[PDB]
Structures are given as structure tokens and as C-alpha cells.
Design a binder for this molecule. Structure first.
Ligand SMILES: Cc1cc2nc3c(=O)[nH]c(=O)nc-3n(C[C@H](O)[C@H](O)[C@H](O)COP(=O)(O)O)c2cc1C
Ligand SMILES: Cc1cc2nc3c(=O)[nH]c(=O)nc-3n(C[C@H](O)[C@H](O)[C@H](O)COP(=O)(O)O)c2cc1C
Ligand SMILES: Cc1cc2nc3c(=O)[nH]c(=O)nc-3n(C[C@H](O)[C@H](O)[C@H](O)COP(=O)(O)O)c2cc1C
Ligand SMILES: Cc1cc2nc3c(=O)[nH]c(=O)nc-3n(C[C@H](O)[C@H](O)[C@H](O)COP(=O)(O)O)c2cc1C
Lengths: 349, 349, 349, 349
């Protein structure tokens, strides 16, 4: 009896446990956005490490939607060989391969975090002409053709992702990037049908979700990651998230990946173990939409407990899998579950 | 920001953190129910260990309500000097002293667990003439005068506890003992006003809660511990617990301590970390009564997460404090919280 | 097969395991040096925690030999009732009671560490008129009658300790206190028979060891604690410790407790797990005298390994038992050894 | 101050820390002994995991010297491309690549451990016609031409290893395989110059060591792994190991890797944390030959402690790196050492 290691039915899939690798940018792609040797070592290692699902890092649906010049990309058919080999190796190592589709919006074009992370001066786009912070380029507000172009890029990115062998698609609608910035009034001050009211701010994000859902068969889960709150005064709140989650549920979205923050910088975030679990909890229990919990989950007993409480269906792990890629194998034993480990390693367990 | 070590306002008290020592029978009293040297070492150790609240083990309100011949008792003024010294030493070591008033019902009169735990053949009482299991005496069904006698014993037990300096009173209405056995239909098959319907099965337990609430001033929390489910087919369920909780809330009970099981033996209990947290979560969120979570909570991150999720207001620890009495001190440091340790020990932290 | 939990024959005793509580000043005695309620809780807690031996903190053989005005003392028959109760409670909780006899020398008369730790200006004594550091009183150099007086105080302290029921006696000859300061040339610049050469600097410490050995029966181990090095240029070194150890062995000392430092302040101490184990290892293997290892031992595997290596016969734990008094109970389980825990606690293991 | 993470000078190299990956057969080579995708994921993962040195698994110097049909081989120039890519990837991931050269001797030709491990009936060779156990083929005793052939195979294997880019060579002279079986009298009952006396039994093993040393430049360390004891009555003992180690030292061997057992089955091995550390300790301190310690080392504090004690120069880790490949990165932090982690992972530390 450990829910953490009990299969999870999502869409038409059965994940072998409730542990997923959270998407984590590695900033190690080529300038063309191609998979490199780094990702082919990085991701299969965690697959052997025991997660039932790996969500590959934010992958830009167009070059202007990248965070860094070394982000993975999926805007071109020439990304398919590298991406396909990535999903193959993840699957061969025992995990279901998924990928997060993303568009950095007004936060596009920054240096690698360990190279300063400074803006590069790209012609970034967003809902309204408001820069992210000091020194960031002023985003060019999108017109209806621009939004349609990016929507089609998300659609083609999903089609490409499926051709590559990925079986879970997450739309990155969080952390102050393009679609997250349309939701929040701190970054969306538009006066047309796509800003102002809650219904208007959700309009373009829900169009993208609907369009992608239509090209992803029901058997393959479609995730949506959101910042359940932007932690800003008068900004996007949990009640807004619940309203947004109800609409995603009606469109056929399979699971809401509940993160927070990122819309603006100078806001206090009450960091603590499980500090975003209440967001996954509220959505799941008040809307009826499956949720993924993420945020300072580092312990087997902690992960099992939030599942026991009904706060989420899926536990996503980020930083603990950077420093302990085999955490799932050893977590099973910690919970009294015989770990399914590679035969080459059975003598180590 | 670690909710686990943020003070908790309960009634007129401020507990210095959200950690409590769960009531744990020691089977080390005298034959007259007196505090001994064992308790005077056992409990202060855990108060120095850093819990904000210590719930002293099940203390019998009448001799026939004891589990073992070596249970703590509170049926006599003769118990007051030892209980007063116990509360003084707990408080001297930094924790708020509390105590669980109990009546073992049809499970009364068994040997110490490490001495066979076999029934002793007492003239035990219960709701219905049904033995707990093979070899147990058949309970004598209580009449209305008998229930009133035990109710008054709970009232006098509470008054005595307060004179002794205890500031939190918990009523043991869980684990198949007297009041638990009235709640569950597996043990209560009465056809009068105190069995059959849910309202009838709650009647005597609620009468006790109200009578005790009347003699416990508002500043001092009144807890009630319940088996949120008995895990038996057609037995006491979470929905029943919610109904029971709404009635306790109206009576002025401060907090529901959510355990499970113990009513009958041959039931499958899905043990796992936090497996009883969903019961505290449901009561808290759907009734609005504060709850205490307990059951295989062993880790600081796990305990912090369930508080961040809103599943409980208080985390109760049992077995982890038997093997690791200073867990709270080291748990603070693990959460980035400067521990408030005895000056004699600062060099160890 | 876990040497850590294999009995240890010392003198006429059998310690039930190779774990001991290292002596740790509590600064909680009365102004007359009496045992208080603090010690009576502090020490039995660790005996229940599973150590086979408890060495009670440095206990001053004369008022002027105290570190603080709140040190334990043993210079009076008036100390016997409290010390006897301390040993009884330690033994009642399963551990052999031992005690460290001490004389603070030129570091005598300082405030409690959490009360500034500043010197109080006592008429302290030492080998040479050299203050420990800025602000400390200049020690009055002892004459032969003065050393004989302190030697007799150590003898009467040992006799008193034995009457109180202590079964292991350790002589504190480390950490810059009186006898340590005679050993080290950084504190001892005498030109008579008790300074200069190594033989001269060992003379008074060895006289004390021999005098105490004479009044401690062979069945009860006599320990000596030493700073195996003072970490100062041209100071007391490991080779000196080996010479000192050979002399202690010939006198009948049972075990050398190998610490370091404390003679002067401005020295670089290479702190790291097990950093003093090489000193216990060298003494044990090159002199053949049993040794106790101490210093940043915090883990069962670490403690078991140094015993498997033959670096020591006894593992002494200090600060880890301040924050985790039940470490030995949980350490047994971690080494595949069924722990022998109080029956009241079996359900926690 | 953590010796575990202080550079180690060996031969002409400087390893960046004192942690090495012990050689661990993966049984995942082709039937031709070629490196496969498994090793190219398995080994670089541990290199990123932080070890300063990786000793690649037992690699057979001739097909008959293999343990399984899926062992790595080095008997052919066609092994060089795969082996060279393996060492390149290890080095690119930050670790020095080394390789263990081996000959299974009378234990050659067994199935994979997770496929029964049963003998296959190969024409195995050994010192004397004594089978390993029931069902094992009777080894054909080597003649002087056969020993010379295997010696030359070790020499050519070393030359090939160096051509491939390996900078540390270990000769596998332990665990009852060919050269280990020449040392022990349980398996060597020869009546010529290569059995009987200690000098005779060491003869062929020392010829191999000398021959390999001559083709490995002094700048590149040459290790020799031995079973310091066979745990058998009248068998190879620690005193024999010391005599053998003195001769290896005079030949120019850089480090003795101290294991145990494997010569025969039915012997009791006192398994415990650090149980082979006393062998590395005795060799290092009584012979003056650098040693590697291995055997149930799982903890940073444990590893640091045996280095502090002078029991070994190098800590080798086996099974802990199968279940926790990034142990070295997290061990550094546990010891107060800023870990050198890949920039992509800095946010996880
Ligand atoms: C290096 C790094 C890269 C990340 N990249 C992404 C990303 O591309 N998309 C995303 O939604 N979240 C990203 N995150 C956030 C994590 O996915 C996760 O939501 C967050 O770090 C909290 O989870 P954790 O505490 O387990 O790490 C990243 C985090 C880190 C540390
Ligand atoms: C030895 C022992 C005695 C206990 N005594 C009581 C008790 O007297 N009253 C009660 O309500 N629960 C009692 N319990 C149950 C615990 O208080 C707690 O609810 C349960 O053990 C689950 O919490 P845990 O996993 O942290 O131990 C006892 C448990 C143990 C192991
Ligand atoms: C509060 C405290 C009091 C101590 N008192 C003594 C003492 O009275 N006599 C002594 O020889 N060592 C004393 N020590 C040193 C310890 O006994 C022990 O040798 C040292 O702390 C290193 O061991 P550890 O790392 O396990 O704590 C004391 C240490 C502390 C932290
Ligand atoms: C799967 C496995 C394969 C091993 N292969 C080898 C080997 O090829 N050569 C060798 O000398 N030791 C081998 N060993 C023994 C280890 O290298 C190591 O000496 C031993 O397991 C004790 O170290 P540990 O407790 O850290 O695992 C192997 C051990 C395991 C579990």
C-alpha cells in the first residue's frame, strides 16, 4: 500500500507510478534548438532512476519564444530526429516520454542563468507593451494575426511532438511567459477582447488549449501548467485559477500542473515544502480536474502523504532529481515497496 | 516561513508550534492508576524535545474503564498529586500539558502488550452484548443510569485534570473503546435511543462532549479523538465523521483528532504515510472544524506539507517520538528554522 | 556481527555495547556543586537512549577547580546524596554510570557559556604564571605541597565517586585544564622537576593517575582523557601522547580517551568527521593500550567502521546525544541489529 | 577541511578527490566483449556524479578469462574503439578513467547472475585441478607456456588500455579468479615452483605485476586488487597479504586495493560496514604501500573518518553508486564542501 507507486490512469495511458520529472531547462541545446549529447545523458538517467513519466524541459514553438539561445526547439521538422532519439531513449530506460511546449513571451531572449541571465534585446512579444523588469525589452503587443500564428505554432509543435514519439504534452502557461502573461492583469492591460475582464484574459490561452487538444488524441494526456497565483497585489489569484481550470476541464484537458509566480519579480513568495500543494488541492477538490503537485517535494513520505490526502494525482519532482536522479528507486524501498530496478543494479538494492 | 513552527492560537492558548505528542499508553502506572517515575521521565523528555503540546496517554475515568491494570487513572482525588507533578514537569520543560480522558468499554481489562495482552475477564461494559473478539468477555449493555454515571465520570475527570494544571482536554472517542463503540454499528446494535440511526449512535458520545465542554472553560481547548472510519463493510465512514464533526463544532469542541480503526480486528487497514490525513483534511475543509492529523507522520517536510495544504491545523506524532524524542528540535533546523533549544544544548545545534 | 553492539569487557565490567556518552558540562548544578533536577532528567534520558556507558560531565575535585560556579562538584560528603541518586537513575535506565574527575587549572572561574563565558577573577592555579588568554587571571604556580593537595583531592574525589556507585572513573587531563596544562609546553614553562623535559611535564599527571589507580579497584576501569595534541607549534604532539600512554599502561590505566586542543586558543584545528580517531588509532596499535575515540562521530556506519579498523575499543558520542539522545537505539536497527529497547517503546521500533 | 575531497597524488596524476567507483561487472557487453550503450550511459553518469576516478569493471584479457559471455574484453584491437569512447565519455564527464584487467581462472564461464549464474562448462584453467564448487568444471592446471601466454595477455591488455586513454590500470588478483587462486593454498596445491610455499604461490602473480608495470609508465598508477584474506581455515591470511604487498611495493605498484573472499564458497564472512578497512589499514601502516579501502562504505562521515585515521588513501564505492550515482556531489555538501556540480544542476544544490 503506497499510492506513490500505484499505477495512474491518465488519458489512455497507465503510468507505472505517481512520480514525474518536472520540466527543467538545461540550456544545452544547439543554437538551432537541437537535442545534444547532454540531454541524451541527462534524461535517460532519470528514466532509469524510476520516474513513470519524464516531462522534457520547456521547448520553444518558435525561435522568438525561446528563453535562451540554447533552448530546445520544435519549430522545425529538423528537430524531429533529435527529439525522436530523446523520447526513444527515455522510453527504453523505462519511463513514458513527455514534453512541455512553451513560448517565453515578454521574458524571451535571456542569457544562460550561469552566464548572467541578462536580456539579449530580442524583439519579444506579449499581451501589452510592459517590460518584465528593468533592462528588459518592451514587448510588442500581439495582434490577432500574431496570436493566431503562435497558436498554430503550438498546434504544429504538438503534432511534431507526437510524430517524435512523445505521449504526454504539457502547455507551458505559467511563470510569466507568453500565455501566463495573458492571464495575469499585472502584464495584460489590453483594452480589446483579450484583456481586462477575467473572461477576456483567459480567451487567448483557452484558444490555444482547445486548438492543441484537437490535434492530441484523447488517449494521450494533455497537461496545462499554470501559475495558480502570481503572488502580486490585485494579480492572478487561486479563484481565477479555479475558473480557468473549470474551462480547461470542459475542453478536455487531462491534468493541471500547479506552479506559481514568475509574472513579475518583486513579490514575496512563501517558500516552504509543499507550498504549492494547496493550489493542486483546491483545483482537484473544487473543480474535479486531476492535478500535478510540484514545489519543494523531496521526500517519499511527503509525496505519499499529499496523495493520501487527495491534494493531487501526480507528484512532480524537479531539483531533487538534479542532485539525486535515482531517488524514485530508493524511495520505493523507503516505503516498503520492492523497487523495479535494472538487473545490473539488483545487488545494490 | 515554516507553518510547522508558527504558533497556533487554540482557545485562549498559544502553542509555540504545530507539533504535538500523540497520546501513547505506557502501561507503567501503579495498580491504583498513579503516576510513577516512568511517566515523570518519559513525558518531560519529549517536552524538552520541542513539541508545543503533549497529550498524556489515555487516562481512565473509572477503574473499569482501564485498558490494563497499569493504566493512568483520574477517578480519585488521590490521583491529583501525581498528575499535578506530571503537568508541572511537562510545563517546566517548555510544552503545554494536555491529557486524554478515556474509557475502554468492551476492550477493558487486558494484560500489558508485552505480557500477552490477553483479557482478564472484567465485568466490562459496552453498547451491546457483543464481545470484541474470541476470548473477550461479553460486554454488559449499559442502561441510561450507567451511561449517566460514566458521563459524570468524564466530567469529574475533566475537572480533576484542570485542577492538576492540564490546559488541553481530549476525549478518547476512537479505537473501539466505549464511546467509539457506541458510534460504530459494528459494535453498537442497540434498538433504543442510543443505537440504530446515526443520530442515535452519536447521542451518548455527544452528551459526554457537551457535559465536558460545560466544565472546561473556553480558554482551554477541548479535543475529541475519533476513528474517522472503522474500515469495516457498512461501518462508520468518513461521511458519518463529518456529521459527527458538525455536531461537535456546534457544541464548541475546538479540534477533532482524526485517527481510525480499532473497533473490530479483522479489517484491512491501508497503512501508508499520512493515510489518515484525508480524514483530517475532509473535516477541516468541509465542516470548518480544526483538525489534528496523525498516523505515520515521521518527517519534517511531510508534516509541513500537509499544513501548507490545509489538511490539518495540528500535527500529532506518536511512534517517531518513542524512538526519537528530540525530533522537533532537529526538524526545525531541517526546515531552515533556528531551533529554540535549551541553552545547555546550543553547542549541539 | 556489529562490533558497535558487541559487549566490551573492561576491567571486571561488561559494557553491553561500544557506545558511551562523552562527558559534557551542563552548567546546571547549584552554587555548592550539587546535582539538580536538570542532571536527573538529562542523563537517564541518554541511558534509556541505549549507550552502554555514561561518563558524567567534568566534576570538580575542589571549588577552585571548577570551570563555572554551576559545575558539578565532588569535594564534599554533601555531594554524595545527589551523585548517588544520579548514578542510581543512570543504572536504573540501563547504562553503567561513570564520572569524569576534573580540575580546571588556569581556565577555572568563567561564566556559563550562554552568559558571556568571561573570567570571574578567581585565584586560579597552574603550572606556570601564564594567563590562558587576554583578560584571564595569571595562574599562581603550584608548589609541591599544592600539587600534593590537588592529588589528594583527586584521590578523595575518586573514593567519593565509588561510594556513590560510579563504576568507571575518568581523569580529565585534556583541554588545557590543570593536568593538561602541565603536559603541554605552551602552558608549562617550569624549570623545576615538573616542567621542561617530557618526563618532567608528565610527572605530576602520572602521580595523580597512580594515586587514583591505587584507590580504584581493578574491576572498575580507570580512564584518562588527554588532548593527544594541542595543535600548537612545538607543543604537545602525538609522539608525546604515545610516551604518556605507555606510562599510563604500566600504571594500570585501562583506557585512554583521546581528545585534542584546548590548551591555547589561537591554533588552527583541522575539524572533520573522525579527526581525532588517528590519535586513538596510534595509541591502540603502537602502545597496546585500549582507547576511546571521540570527535564528530555522528553515524552508525562511521562508528562501526573505526572499530572494524581497530582504531579504538570504545566510541564516545558528545553533541549528537545532545540533539538525538536515542541515537544508539536507532543506530542498532540501522546496522541490522535487533535493538534492546524499553518494552514501553517496542511498538516504535 | 575534508580529506575525502582533497586532491590525491598517485603516480603522476592528481585525482580531484579521494572517491573512486569500484569495478562492477555489468554483464552487458556483446558476445564479442564490446562496449555497448549500457556502459556508455552507466559510467558517465557516475562521472557526473562526482567521483575523481572510475575503475571500469573486470575486463577479460582473453575470452577464456571472462566471467560471463557478456563481459567486457580487451583481447583484441577491435575492442579499442568502444573502450576508447568509454574512457572519453568518463573523462568528458569529469572523472579519470581507469580499468580493471582480469582473468576469471577456474571460475570462468558462468551465466549472468540474474539468469542463474550457473557454470557453462568452459575449458577453464587454474593453478591446480580443483573445481571451485559442485558442478563447476575441473580447471586444467597451467603449464609454464600457459602462464606465459596469460602474462602476455595481461601485458597486451595494459598496452591496449593505455592506447584507449585509460590512466589507471588495476590488476584483478582477488576473489578466487586466476591470480588470486595461485596465491591461496585452498586452490593452489601445485608441487612445482608455483605452489606450496608462500614464495612459490606469489611467483606467477608477481611475474604478472612486474610485466605489466614495465609497460605502464610511472606517471600512470598501477593498482593491484587482492583478497587480503580468503576467510578459510589455513588459507591466505593478512600476514600473507603483507608479505605480498611488500613485494608489490618493491616492483613499483602504486596502490593495493584491499578486498577479501571469493576463493571458495562455504566460509563465514563477518559482513559489516568497513569490514575490509582493517586490511587496507594494516597494509598501509605496516608496509608503507598506499591502499584503497572498499566494502560497505556508504556514508560521507564514514569515508572521511577512515581517511582521517590513516586506514587508506583512496575510498572505493561499489553498491552505493548503483543506487545513488550522484552520492559524491551530495556527500560534499554533507561535509561542508561546496560541490563542483555541472552548471545545469547548480540550482539543485
Ligand atoms: C534549472 C531549472 C529549470 C526549470 N525549468 C522549467 C521549465 O522549463 N518549465 C517549467 O514549467 N518549470 C521549470 N522549472 C521549475 C520546476 O520545473 C519546478 O516547477 C520547480 O523548480 C519546483 O519544483 P522542485 O522544488 O521540485 O524543484 C525549472 C526549475 C529549475 C531549477
Ligand atoms: C504504544 C502506543 C500507545 C498508544 N496509546 C494511545 C492512546 O492511549 N490513545 C490514543 O488515542 N491513541 C494511542 N496510540 C495511537 C497513537 O497515539 C497514534 O494515533 C498512532 O500510533 C498513529 O500515529 P503514529 O504513526 O505517529 O504512531 C498509541 C500508539 C502506541 C504505539
Ligand atoms: C557542552 C559541551 C560540554 C563538554 N564538556 C566536556 C567535559 O566536561 N569534559 C571533557 O573532557 N569534554 C567535554 N566536552 C567535549 C566533548 O565531550 C567531546 O569530546 C567533543 O564535543 C567532541 O565530541 P563530539 O563531536 O561527539 O561532540 C564538552 C562538549 C560540549 C559540546
Ligand atoms: C554487481 C557487482 C559487480 C562487481 N564486480 C566486480 C568486479 O568486476 N571486480 C572486482 O574486483 N569487484 C567487483 N565487485 C565487488 C565490488 O567492486 C566491491 O569490492 C564490493 O562490492 C564491496 O564494495 P561495496 O560494499 O561498496 O559494494 C562487484 C560487486 C557488485 C555488487
Amino acid at each position: 500500500m503506497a499510492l506513490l507507486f500505484t499505477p495512474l490512469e491518465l488519458g489512455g495511458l497507465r503510468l507505472k507510478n505517481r512520480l514525474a520529472m518536472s520540466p527543467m531547462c538545461q540550456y544545452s541545446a544547439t543554437l538551432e534548438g537541437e537535442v545534444t549529447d547532454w540531454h541524451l545523458l541527462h534524461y535517460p538517467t532519470r528514466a532509469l532512476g524510476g520516474v513513470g513519466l519524464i516531462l522534457v524541459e520547456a521547448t520553444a514553438v518558435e525561435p522568438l519564444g525561446r528563453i535562451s539561445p540554447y533552448d530546445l526547439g520544435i519549430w522545425s521538422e529538423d528537430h524531429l530526429p533529435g527529439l525522436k532519439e530523446l523520447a526513444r531513449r527515455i522510453r527504453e530506460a523505462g519511463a513514458v516520454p513527455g514534453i512541455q511546449l512553451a513560448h517565453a513571451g515578454r521574458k524571451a531572449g535571456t542569457a544562460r542563468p550561469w552566464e548572467g541571465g541578462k536580456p539579449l534585446g530580442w524583439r519579444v512579444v506579449g499581451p501589452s507593451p510592459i517590460p518584465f523588469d528593468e533592462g528588459y525589452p518592451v514587448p510588442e503587443p500581439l495582434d490577432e494575426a500574431g496570436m493566431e500564428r503562435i497558436l498554430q505554432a503550438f498546434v504544429e509543435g504538438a503534432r511534431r511532438a507526437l510524430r517524435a514519439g512523445f505521449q504526454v504534452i504539457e502547455l507551458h502557461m505559467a511563470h510569466g511567459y507568453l500565455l501566463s502573461s495573458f492571464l495575469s492583469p499585472l502584464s495584460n492591460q489590453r483594452t480589446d477582447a483579450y484583456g481586462g475582464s477575467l473572461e477576456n484574459r483567459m480567451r487567448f490561452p483557452l484558444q490555444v488549449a482547445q486548438a492543441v487538444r484537437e490535434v492530441v488524441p484523447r488517449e494521450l494526456p494533455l497537461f496545462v501548467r499554470v501559475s495558480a497565483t502570481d503572488w502580486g497585489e490585485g494579480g492572478w489569484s487561486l479563484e481565477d485559477t479555479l475558473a480557468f481550470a473549470r474551462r480547461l476541464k470542459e475542453l478536455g484537458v487531462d491534468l493541471l500542473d500547479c506552479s506559481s509566480g514568475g509574472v513579475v519579480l518583486r513579490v514575496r513568495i512563501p517558500l516552504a515544502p509543499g507550498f504549492q500543494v494547496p493550489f493542486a488541492d483546491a483545483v482537484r477538490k473544487r473543480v474535479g480536474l486531476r492535478t500535478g503537485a510540484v514545489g519543494l517535494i523531496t521526500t517519499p513520505e511527503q509525496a505519499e502523504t499529499l496523495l493520501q490526502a487527495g491534494s493531487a494525482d501526480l507528484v512532480l519532482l524537479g531539483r531533487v532529481l538534479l542532485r539525486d536522479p535515482y531517488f524514485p528507486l530508493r524511495a520505493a524501498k523507503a516505503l516498503g515497496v520492492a523497487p523495479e530496478v535494472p538487473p545490473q543494479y539488483q545487488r545494490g538494492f
